[PDB]
Amino acid sequence: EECAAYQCNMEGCTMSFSSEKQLMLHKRNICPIKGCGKNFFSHKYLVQHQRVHSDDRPLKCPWKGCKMTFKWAWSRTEHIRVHTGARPYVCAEPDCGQTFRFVSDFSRHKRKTGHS
Ligand SMILES: [Zn+2]
Ligand SMILES: [Zn+2]
Ligand SMILES: [Zn+2]
Ligand SMILES: [Zn+2]
């Protein structure tokens, strides 16, 4: 529990450990995952790396029949548009008329072409 766990006091960190030993190793920027052993120059590099080990996708698609899962809410929201058929981003150029499901596709289109 909280009482027994050892919390990290680095700014922005939300990690905790089963022992003071593993907290001390964590403060030396050693990966928390068994068998990895990678060390990092800063605490920011460590936290970013740990995410690569995780296959956790907590957010389930709400569309009945769909078994897809997502790490981030924005990714899930973008995905749901596949089911609804929504194309929110419409090109403003006069003879284009092109639509896009994701903003990154719309941004890529505006960069690739010279469109408003
Ligand atoms: Zn930490
Ligand atoms: Zn690692
Ligand atoms: Zn879905
Ligand atoms: Zn366009």
PDB file of C-alpha atoms and ligand atoms in Angstrom:
ATOM      1  CA  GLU A   1       0.000   0.000   0.000  1.00  0.00           C
ATOM      2  CA  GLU A   2       0.900   3.740   0.147  1.00  0.00           C
ATOM      3  CA  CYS A   3       2.389   3.329   3.647  1.00  0.00           C
ATOM      4  CA  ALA A   4       4.696   0.488   2.570  1.00  0.00           C
ATOM      5  CA  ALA A   5       5.562   1.971  -0.858  1.00  0.00           C
ATOM      6  CA  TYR A   6       8.491   4.333  -1.466  1.00  0.00           C
ATOM      7  CA  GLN A   7       7.461   7.369  -3.540  1.00  0.00           C
ATOM      8  CA  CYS A   8       9.818   9.312  -5.847  1.00  0.00           C
ATOM      9  CA  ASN A   9      10.319  12.967  -4.837  1.00  0.00           C
ATOM     10  CA  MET A  10      11.532  14.194  -8.262  1.00  0.00           C
ATOM     11  CA  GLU A  11       9.365  16.965  -9.734  1.00  0.00           C
ATOM     12  CA  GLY A  12       6.578  15.557 -11.924  1.00  0.00           C
ATOM     13  CA  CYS A  13       7.325  11.893 -11.102  1.00  0.00           C
ATOM     14  CA  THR A  14       4.420   9.668 -10.020  1.00  0.00           C
ATOM     15  CA  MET A  15       6.376   6.407  -9.593  1.00  0.00           C
ATOM     16  CA  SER A  16       6.682   4.327  -6.419  1.00  0.00           C
ATOM     17  CA  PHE A  17       8.676   1.261  -5.346  1.00  0.00           C
ATOM     18  CA  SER A  18       8.449  -1.814  -3.106  1.00  0.00           C
ATOM     19  CA  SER A  19      11.703  -0.959  -1.283  1.00  0.00           C
ATOM     20  CA  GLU A  20      14.070   1.924  -0.548  1.00  0.00           C
ATOM     21  CA  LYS A  21      16.662  -0.031  -2.566  1.00  0.00           C
ATOM     22  CA  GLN A  22      14.621   0.238  -5.763  1.00  0.00           C
ATOM     23  CA  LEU A  23      13.864   3.911  -5.055  1.00  0.00           C
ATOM     24  CA  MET A  24      17.624   4.586  -4.744  1.00  0.00           C
ATOM     25  CA  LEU A  25      18.270   2.783  -8.046  1.00  0.00           C
ATOM     26  CA  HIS A  26      15.428   4.816  -9.581  1.00  0.00           C
ATOM     27  CA  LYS A  27      17.097   8.079  -8.435  1.00  0.00           C
ATOM     28  CA  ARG A  28      20.241   6.914 -10.315  1.00  0.00           C
ATOM     29  CA  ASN A  29      18.050   6.793 -13.469  1.00  0.00           C
ATOM     30  CA  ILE A  30      18.189   3.004 -13.822  1.00  0.00           C
ATOM     31  CA  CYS A  31      15.181   1.530 -15.665  1.00  0.00           C
ATOM     32  CA  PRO A  32      12.567   0.104 -13.222  1.00  0.00           C
ATOM     33  CA  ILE A  33      11.841  -3.001 -15.369  1.00  0.00           C
ATOM     34  CA  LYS A  34      13.308  -6.433 -14.540  1.00  0.00           C
ATOM     35  CA  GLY A  35      15.999  -7.525 -17.033  1.00  0.00           C
ATOM     36  CA  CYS A  36      16.464  -4.169 -18.820  1.00  0.00           C
ATOM     37  CA  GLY A  37      19.411  -2.541 -17.002  1.00  0.00           C
ATOM     38  CA  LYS A  38      19.517   0.638 -19.130  1.00  0.00           C
ATOM     39  CA  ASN A  39      20.762   3.785 -17.331  1.00  0.00           C
ATOM     40  CA  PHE A  40      19.917   7.369 -18.364  1.00  0.00           C
ATOM     41  CA  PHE A  41      21.493  10.828 -18.071  1.00  0.00           C
ATOM     42  CA  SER A  42      18.383  12.490 -16.629  1.00  0.00           C
ATOM     43  CA  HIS A  43      15.110  11.638 -14.972  1.00  0.00           C
ATOM     44  CA  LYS A  44      13.130  12.821 -18.042  1.00  0.00           C
ATOM     45  CA  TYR A  45      14.965  10.290 -20.274  1.00  0.00           C
ATOM     46  CA  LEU A  46      14.236   7.511 -17.742  1.00  0.00           C
ATOM     47  CA  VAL A  47      10.471   8.185 -17.553  1.00  0.00           C
ATOM     48  CA  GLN A  48      10.102   8.362 -21.359  1.00  0.00           C
ATOM     49  CA  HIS A  49      11.998   5.062 -21.756  1.00  0.00           C
ATOM     50  CA  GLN A  50       9.879   3.121 -19.202  1.00  0.00           C
ATOM     51  CA  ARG A  51       6.775   3.788 -21.366  1.00  0.00           C
ATOM     52  CA  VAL A  52       8.336   1.724 -24.208  1.00  0.00           C
ATOM     53  CA  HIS A  53       8.113  -1.423 -22.022  1.00  0.00           C
ATOM     54  CA  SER A  54       4.386  -0.883 -21.338  1.00  0.00           C
ATOM     55  CA  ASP A  55       1.741  -2.411 -23.621  1.00  0.00           C
ATOM     56  CA  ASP A  56      -0.977  -0.832 -21.421  1.00  0.00           C
ATOM     57  CA  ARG A  57      -3.824   0.622 -23.495  1.00  0.00           C
ATOM     58  CA  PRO A  58      -6.403   1.472 -20.800  1.00  0.00           C
ATOM     59  CA  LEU A  59      -9.032   3.222 -22.956  1.00  0.00           C
ATOM     60  CA  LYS A  60     -11.495   0.896 -24.732  1.00  0.00           C
ATOM     61  CA  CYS A  61     -13.393   1.903 -27.853  1.00  0.00           C
ATOM     62  CA  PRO A  62     -17.058   2.519 -26.911  1.00  0.00           C
ATOM     63  CA  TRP A  63     -18.413   1.218 -30.274  1.00  0.00           C
ATOM     64  CA  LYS A  64     -20.139  -2.159 -29.741  1.00  0.00           C
ATOM     65  CA  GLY A  65     -18.279  -4.951 -31.571  1.00  0.00           C
ATOM     66  CA  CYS A  66     -14.941  -3.108 -31.556  1.00  0.00           C
ATOM     67  CA  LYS A  67     -12.137  -4.562 -29.419  1.00  0.00           C
ATOM     68  CA  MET A  68      -9.569  -1.795 -30.075  1.00  0.00           C
ATOM     69  CA  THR A  69      -7.822  -0.147 -27.122  1.00  0.00           C
ATOM     70  CA  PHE A  70      -5.796   3.056 -26.721  1.00  0.00           C
ATOM     71  CA  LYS A  71      -3.110   4.653 -24.577  1.00  0.00           C
ATOM     72  CA  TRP A  72      -4.349   8.259 -25.008  1.00  0.00           C
ATOM     73  CA  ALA A  73      -7.830   9.829 -25.165  1.00  0.00           C
ATOM     74  CA  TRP A  74      -7.026  11.798 -28.355  1.00  0.00           C
ATOM     75  CA  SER A  75      -6.071   8.555 -30.170  1.00  0.00           C
ATOM     76  CA  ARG A  76      -9.352   6.923 -29.100  1.00  0.00           C
ATOM     77  CA  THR A  77     -11.369  10.006 -30.130  1.00  0.00           C
ATOM     78  CA  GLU A  78      -9.694  10.048 -33.570  1.00  0.00           C
ATOM     79  CA  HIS A  79     -10.387   6.306 -33.935  1.00  0.00           C
ATOM     80  CA  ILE A  80     -14.119   6.663 -33.127  1.00  0.00           C
ATOM     81  CA  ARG A  81     -14.435   8.889 -36.233  1.00  0.00           C
ATOM     82  CA  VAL A  82     -13.700   5.760 -38.339  1.00  0.00           C
ATOM     83  CA  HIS A  83     -16.977   4.300 -37.018  1.00  0.00           C
ATOM     84  CA  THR A  84     -19.034   7.516 -37.283  1.00  0.00           C
ATOM     85  CA  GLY A  85     -17.628   8.534 -40.702  1.00  0.00           C
ATOM     86  CA  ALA A  86     -16.857  12.055 -39.446  1.00  0.00           C
ATOM     87  CA  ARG A  87     -14.440  14.147 -41.549  1.00  0.00           C
ATOM     88  CA  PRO A  88     -14.104  17.311 -39.400  1.00  0.00           C
ATOM     89  CA  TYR A  89     -11.317  19.057 -41.343  1.00  0.00           C
ATOM     90  CA  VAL A  90     -12.356  20.586 -44.675  1.00  0.00           C
ATOM     91  CA  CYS A  91      -9.885  22.299 -47.017  1.00  0.00           C
ATOM     92  CA  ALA A  92     -10.716  25.984 -47.616  1.00  0.00           C
ATOM     93  CA  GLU A  93      -9.285  26.207 -51.185  1.00  0.00           C
ATOM     94  CA  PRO A  94     -11.880  26.922 -53.929  1.00  0.00           C
ATOM     95  CA  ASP A  95     -11.384  23.919 -56.270  1.00  0.00           C
ATOM     96  CA  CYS A  96     -10.119  21.391 -53.663  1.00  0.00           C
ATOM     97  CA  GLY A  97     -13.078  20.283 -51.492  1.00  0.00           C
ATOM     98  CA  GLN A  98     -10.945  17.661 -49.727  1.00  0.00           C
ATOM     99  CA  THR A  99     -11.857  16.420 -46.218  1.00  0.00           C
ATOM    100  CA  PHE A 100      -9.809  14.710 -43.479  1.00  0.00           C
ATOM    101  CA  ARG A 101     -10.541  12.555 -40.415  1.00  0.00           C
ATOM    102  CA  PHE A 102      -7.424  13.502 -38.404  1.00  0.00           C
ATOM    103  CA  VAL A 103      -5.873  16.973 -38.035  1.00  0.00           C
ATOM    104  CA  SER A 104      -2.366  15.604 -38.833  1.00  0.00           C
ATOM    105  CA  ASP A 105      -3.648  14.532 -42.282  1.00  0.00           C
ATOM    106  CA  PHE A 106      -5.108  18.036 -42.795  1.00  0.00           C
ATOM    107  CA  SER A 107      -1.812  19.660 -41.694  1.00  0.00           C
ATOM    108  CA  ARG A 108       0.158  17.333 -44.009  1.00  0.00           C
ATOM    109  CA  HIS A 109      -2.152  18.270 -46.920  1.00  0.00           C
ATOM    110  CA  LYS A 110      -1.684  22.019 -46.264  1.00  0.00           C
ATOM    111  CA  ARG A 111       2.126  21.545 -46.151  1.00  0.00           C
ATOM    112  CA  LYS A 112       2.347  19.277 -49.234  1.00  0.00           C
ATOM    113  CA  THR A 113       0.070  21.522 -51.324  1.00  0.00           C
ATOM    114  CA  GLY A 114      -0.201  25.342 -51.042  1.00  0.00           C
ATOM    115  CA  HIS A 115      -3.798  25.266 -49.798  1.00  0.00           C
ATOM    116  CA  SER A 116      -5.690  27.378 -47.246  1.00  0.00           C
TER     117      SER A 116
HETATM  118 ZN    ZN B   1      11.013   9.387 -10.244  1.00  0.00          ZN
HETATM  119 ZN    ZN B   2      14.078  -0.374 -19.674  1.00  0.00          ZN
HETATM  120 ZN    ZN B   3     -13.586   1.137 -32.404  1.00  0.00          ZN
HETATM  121 ZN    ZN B   4      -6.849  21.353 -50.220  1.00  0.00          ZN
END
